[PDB]
């Protein structure tokens, strides 16, 4: 009332692309508890890595690591189907508890992080200045990661549809699409957004018939 325990920085986890996703926002009052359901990046994924982050930078690597931990025992499934509920709970005493539960398996790993873990009053002031200093670079990064994952999904999606299509697909139209997927997957290996979009553009244009079937 003359005083608040607040989170001086945001707390979250790394997600696909090397982006920090925020669970508890900067300048949140303690105690608190926020949960979010995540899934797998790839088919028959048997584990996820929960990499815990303190900071305001959109790039996982530019934020402060508080630890990591694995949740194994993910049963086979298509990617983006499993439910991994990640929850951050900070109690009154200043302790953070990150849990990851497979809502199928009922499996669960926790990690506990001392109130004293992370960046001292100084490193925090730098971190906030550096975030403002790089809202452009981080915008432009985020936009590319979005673009990549969109490309990635469109890649994996177009492969399923070709298998479930099979015989039903003109020889012609399959080749044209085998070429465009090979080109997209190569451009996803790069850092050039425009290049990714143009391979994505190429696939749309030559996929028209695969979509009807599908």
């Amino acid at each position: 009332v003359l005083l608040l325990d607040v989170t001086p920085l945001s707390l979250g986890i790394e997600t696909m692309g090397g982006v920090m996703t925020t669970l508890i926002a900067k300048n949140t009052t303690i105690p608190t508890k926020h949960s979010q359901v995540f899934s797998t990046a790839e088919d028959n994924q048997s584990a996820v890595t929960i990499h815990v982050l303190q900071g305001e930078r959109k790039r996982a690597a530019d934020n402060k690591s508080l630890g990591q931990f694995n949740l194994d025992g993910i049963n086979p499934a298509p990617r983006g189907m499993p439910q991994i509920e990640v929850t951050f709970d900070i109690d009154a005493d200043g302790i953070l508890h990150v849990s990851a539960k497979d809502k199928n398996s009922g499996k669960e790993q926790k990690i506990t992080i001392k109130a004293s873990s992370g960046l001292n009053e100084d490193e925090i002031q730098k971190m906030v200045r550096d975030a403002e200093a790089n809202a452009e670079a981080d915008r432009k990064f985020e936009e590319l990661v979005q673009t990549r994952n969109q490309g990635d999904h469109l890649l994996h999606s177009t492969r399923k549809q070709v298998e479930e299509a099979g015989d039903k697909l003109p020889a012609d139209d399959k080749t044209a699409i085998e070429s465009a997927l090979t080109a997209l997957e190569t451009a996803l290996k790069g850092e050039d957004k425009a290049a990714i979009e143009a391979k994505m553009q190429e696939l749309a244009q030559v996929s028209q018939k695969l979509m009807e079937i599908a």
Partner: peptide, 4 residues
């Protein structure tokens, strides 16, 4: 989203 998804984790690796």
């Amino acid at each position: 989203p998804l984790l690796g």
